[PDB]
Structure 1
């Protein structure tokens, strides 16, 4: 499924012109400030829900479970603990 340089196994390419400039001719950090602020905000915003939803749910679950467990092993929780065992 992959070849090697010269015969990589690409469908025939035609009609694309690629251009680039030397590493010595470019500013490596061109537009870094804009990217660091605006680009990162865009990328983070677009992914935020996929992180926040599961983290918040499982943190809530853990919080409820740890708080119940703590309460069951108090004096006040004696009866509820007796039933739970």
Structure 2
């Protein structure tokens, strides 16, 4: 088979990153550990940290688009009622 072009990923042994020198890693066998260590602690304290950092980027846009929706629903209901017949003719016509 012919060769291919130049990519930004290789395989095992020639992955294509910088030369590494001075870093050491340690690990323990999974058969000698407790898989469920700290689940109760993380479910409350870690969960509170994650929520507190991102909840402002989601709720503010959501509340803006929900207030817009409710204000448009009430206006339409008032327009097609008996008390809104003076406005329905002056807008839709």
Where structure 2 has 5 or more consecutive residues not aligned to the other structure, the ranges are 1-7
Counterpart check, 1:19 vs 2:26: yes
Once the two structures are TM-superposed, the CA of residue 78 in structure 1 deviates from its matched residue by 1.1
The alignment's C-alpha RMSD in Å is: 1.0
The match for 2:82 among 67, 72, 75 is: 75
Once the two structures are TM-superposed, the CA of residue 68 in structure 1 deviates from its matched residue by 0.8
Q: In structure 2, what is the Cα distance between the partners aligned to 1:67 and 1:49?
A: 27
Q: Which has the larger radius of gyration?
A: 2
Q: In structure 2, what is the Cα distance between the partners aligned to 1:42 and 1:57?
A: 25
TM-score of the aligned structures, taking structure 1 as reference length: 0.92
2:4 counterpart residue number: none
